[PDB]
């Protein structure tokens, strides 16, 4: 707020116009990136209340009704693991953290209860063991291999999901 500087700067041209335009373009682009990544699904699919899916244990990734933020435990670990004038201002994002967590929960419920279908049109429900049999078949292993080792496969999946959180926490 010096009068003489504005008086001398008016002769340099429209540099401020260019700077304002460039920075606003960057900001709108950031908003579009978040939309493009997360907002792929059209309807917010809800998880059924009786959470039994044939031995698989998705508790570490489904949203936690206990915490007020409604984030799964892995998401909580991630949010705590990472943390962070003269005319400079930081603008807020359009989608708050809560709304992004809601979009993610929608994708999880859709993929858990309906498989591939919810991405091609109307979500058609299918039992989770039959869905994994489809995927096994997809990689060239006959589906009887899954039905005869359902117990073992569920145990291995649970163990791996359990070690993921420890790995994220132990890695510096």
């Amino acid at each position: 707020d010096s009068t003489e500087c504005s008086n001398l700067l008016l002769q340099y041209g429209s540099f401020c116009t260019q700077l304002k335009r460039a920075l606003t373009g960057i900001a709108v682009e950031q908003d579009k990136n978040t939309q493009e990544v997360f907002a792929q699904v059209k309807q917010i699919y809800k998880t059924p209340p009786i959470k039994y899916f044939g031995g698989f244990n998705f508790s570490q990734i489904l949203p936690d009704p206990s915490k007020p933020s409604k984030r799964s435990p892995i998401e909580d670990l991630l949010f705590n693991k990472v943390t962070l004038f003269n005319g400079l201002t930081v603008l807020p994002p359009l989608l708050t953290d809560e709304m992004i967590a809601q979009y993610t929960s929608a994708l999880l419920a859709g993929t858990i209860t309906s498989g591939w279908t919810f991405g091609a049109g109307p979500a058609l429900q299918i039992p989770f063991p039959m869905q994994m049999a489809y995927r096994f078949n997809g990689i060239g292993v006959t589906q009887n291999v899954l039905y005869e080792n359902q117990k073992l496969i569920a145990n291995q999946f649970n163990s791996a999901i359990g070690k993921i959180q420890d790995s994220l926490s132990s890695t510096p």
Binding site: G13, T17, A120, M130
Partner: protein
């Protein structure tokens, strides 16, 4: 606003040139913007340092313009590579990549020219009129299990 992208490219280029032309009027601290007056109403020894400012300022303007154009050209090259990939994979064949060539199970795609880009007409197959059923993973007959 169906053609927002192509129109946007055109307007950015036009706006860049307009500002480059407009910056010739600024004085940059010199006593005048037109070269004739500067060289007329002052002696050569002082006219040298009074013309230096305009030269350096206009050179900086031109340098900024070229840098901005390099950045935009990189962006358009990324887009052109994507278009070439879509041509090869969706038009000249059939892609199983999910939701690359349109939403739904991809059948085929048709290209159409546009002033500065392409317009792909993706043809997709979408199910409808679903129905409930009860299912089982296997049938037991004669004591042995059958799978489909």
């Amino acid at each position: 606003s169906a053609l927002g992208k192509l129109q946007d490219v055109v307007n950015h280029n036009a706006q860049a040139l307009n500002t480059l032309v407009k910056q010739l009027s600024s004085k940059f601290g010199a006593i005048s913007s037109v070269l004739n007056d500067i060289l007329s109403r002052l002696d050569p020894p002082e006219a040298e340092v009074q013309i230096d400012r305009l030269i350096t300022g206009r050179l900086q303007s031109l340098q900024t313009y070229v840098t901005q154009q390099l950045i935009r050209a990189a962006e358009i090259r990324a887009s052109a590579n994507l278009a070439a990939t879509k041509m090869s994979e969706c038009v000249l064949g059939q892609s199983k990549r999910v939701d690359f060539c349109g939403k739904g199970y991809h059948l085929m795609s048709f290209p159409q020219s546009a002033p500065h880009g392409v317009v792909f007409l993706h043809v997709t197959y979408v199910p409808a009129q679903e129905k409930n059923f009860t299912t089982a993973p296997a049938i037991c007959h004669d004591g042995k299990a059958h799978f489909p």
